[PDB]
Design a binder for these strands. Structure first.
Lengths: 200, 200, 200, 200
DNA sequence: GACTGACTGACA
DNA sequence: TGTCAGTCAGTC
DNA sequence: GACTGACTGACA
DNA sequence: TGTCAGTCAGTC
């Protein structure tokens, strides 16, 4: 059994997941969590904060998972790295599709809340972000390919693929599990393509 | 002067642009178009249809512009093509930022309307989409790089760059016009990178 | 029959009158005015504005009445003036006890709204206010009695008596009508007392 | 250190002081007193009783202070008396502005509680009240100035000045301390004015 | 037709 | 205490 | 007793 | 989508 608070957060994820911020009611969350609607504003003051706390909760978890990954893989080659990492992200998207579907909702929410969160992210991001800067020094670039330019490309790809598939396979984890294996290939090739394009 | 109907559509774009579907009221559109709120449901029956009509209007325009581009360039090499196209798209995004900002709202709207529109798109898309399929037969691929795989990559890139910058430079057209010229280079490199990666 | 809008304002006066700002519900106003609750926020955006509009409405009226009084009495001696004016104010308080009871509510409402209104008043007040400054030049003061000092005294008395009685005889117009006559005397004496105290 | 109970009462004063009855939450009082919200209804059963207990506490204090003043001054002439008293009251209002600001909230509260308290007051008041009745037999009145009439005037003035300034210099103790000395003169004049007006 | 905007009801 | 898409009665 | 604070329900 | 006075189960 989860503490009422924890069960709110969780229902909030399911609910925001299925409808996104605006379309999602607080009372559905209260029904789904089996709690008094008021309790929600006990813990979270208002809906905006609630979404926020929910999103932090979830990212807390991934960050944890990522940080552990990184250690166990600091040593890998960069692409080899991304290759493997992307794998795990899909494995998560399939083992926790509600969380996945919920993180995607971030764009639906007002300038204010959104920018707030994004900033809280750049912090967490800067780790991985900076690590990549280093593992590129390790590569023999073409004489027209900035490390700056390279980073943008990879960081776009990396997180862009995330949103690219993730809306396409939204509410269809079944269909993802099916297709996972191909995707992983397509990726491996895509990265392989970039490596060949950036190196001498 | 625009017909009252045409001025609704237009205000609807500005409005949906700045708030996205749900947060955007019909009565703001009626204030901003200077019309009776009832008029809106004269012309468009309901808000969903309204967003829809607005989105079609706008895409009618781009498709027209694109189709003309394609003729004047059907002959070019594929990357050379995208290179130059991306250029025009930014030029438009800067000359018509409201339209830009509105097209991006598509993700905020319910399964129903969204899917509808996306389908109406694949239609429009299929032209360019299919043209690319052809200009790739013209290329000497690596022995592990399906035409299928290639197309995904490019089509992702192509429209993914759109969303990548467009949120980053949202409400900052000044800052875009400044940076436009770099971007175009960054792109040319990126495409160059891909060409080198896919070919023998 | 009153326009729905006008009937809201009116019920709002009754209601605020009986409970004051905070304790008073909007839906009671809607019941009492026989209207959709939403219509209220059609016309007045929110409750604060509503109270405000109600208070302006009412003061509009008194100001009108006062301005007419003043003309018909510019010529009187100052006390003779206040004497008579006070009479009329009670005559109003008795002929329109709801309005009376409502104006008193002003103190119950948050710093914001309150200060706003009070300022809108000093404007209207400054007329009477300034007129009094003049009708004192007409008086032979004691050699220790500033016109400044005198004004404060009278302006305090004048409006202070208002609140002094008005809360005491709140919701008791019956009891006021009874007592009106004495009060008018007590006043006449009180003013008479001040005149004797300020003059040589 | 104050007993948790005593610290509730005190925070209740600050809180009711700044927002008045209805706008003031019990949980703010609990935050500001650093206590469990339930504790409040341990000690005071409900919010109405709480305000009440708070108000009595405070008036216990003033009455005590006043009763001591009266002894040390029972002998003085009546105006001389009020003159000097008013002085002390300001001194208190400046040394304890929260208490001041809280006593003024009395009008914001429902018929019931209010009337209750007011009655408990007439009791406390009757002392000073009755003393004044006596010190007026000592005065040679005008042949149209009832002792009754006189008392009203003075009792109004006396406590009316309190409310007159106190709202004007609300949340501005700095500005009061500045002006204190003038006020005291303005008063002395005012009283002087009344003495001259009531006597032969 | 186009056009209005006061008005509602069910919902946060 | 707000919030909004949609309707409705009716003018032009 | 004192003390807590998560929790509710009816209400804006 | 908030708002709040009051309760309730239970520790110390």
């Amino acid at each position: 059994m989860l503490s009422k608070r924890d069960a709110i957060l969780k229902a909030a994820v399911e609910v925001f997941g299925k409808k996104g911020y605006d379309r999602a009611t607080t009372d559905e969350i209260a029904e789904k969590a089996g709690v008094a609607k008021g309790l929600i504003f006990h813990y979270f003051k208002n809906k905006e904060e609630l979404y926020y706390q929910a999103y932090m909760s979830v990212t807390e978890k991934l960050q944890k998972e990522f940080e552990n990954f990184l250690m166990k893989n600091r040593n890998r080659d960069i692409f080899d790295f991304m290759e493997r990492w992307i794998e795990k992200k899909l494995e998560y998207s399939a083992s926790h599709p509600e969380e996945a579907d919920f993180l995607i909702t971030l764009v639906s929410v007002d300038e204010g809340l959104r920018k707030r969160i994004l900033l809280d992210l750049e912090k967490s991001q800067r780790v991985f972000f900076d690590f990549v800067r280093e593992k590129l020094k390790d590569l023999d670039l073409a004489e027209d390919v900035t490390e700056e330019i390279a980073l943008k490309f990879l960081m776009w790809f990396f997180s862009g693929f995330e949103e690219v598939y993730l809306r396409t396979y939204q509410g269809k984890p079944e269909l993802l599990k099916r297709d996972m294996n191909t995707l992983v290939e397509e990726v491996k090739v895509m990265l392989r393509i970039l490596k060949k394009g950036m190196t001498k």
